Amino acid sequence: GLKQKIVIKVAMNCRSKAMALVASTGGVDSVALVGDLRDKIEVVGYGIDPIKLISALRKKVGDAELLQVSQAKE
Template sequence: MAKQKIVVKVSLQSAKDRSKAMRTVVGVSGVETAALQGDDKNQIAVIGEGIDSIELTTSLRKKFGYADLLTVGPDEKKEEKKEEKKDTPVPVVCPPVWPPVFTPIYQEPDPNCCIM
């Protein structure tokens, strides 16, 4: 399933409302990133896979009374970055680990020691 971008307009009056809205959005299953956008920071852009846009707007309406679904579409920015970024794997070189060397220690019996 491809990533999708959903933009929802919500009436956010204070920083406390913005924080509450972000917690609500991140709690929806499938959400990977969420960000505030717009002039008044009253739009929430959500990116993820398998996000139910109706569930998202319904949960925001329950908390804030007003939420309007603006756009739903594929996430174009993420797809472009994946195509441009081509990393070559770096070989990992680990130093060899040698087993510890055990030398047996032999002691001559003490002639003064007597065990009965």
């Protein structure tokens, strides 16, 4: 499971800004707005530091909370 799945709740046009910031991170394969309110970003990639990502989001977009970290599997 070399690839990580990270789900982040963001106070969120903040959606486009939050999406651009995460999309621009090194190792990213995908970003997706998920949940019924589209108030979550799921990122899949390699060598992504969730702590740096949450910090980037909080200084740039607004409140953000790590919700889910799992591996992908083959």
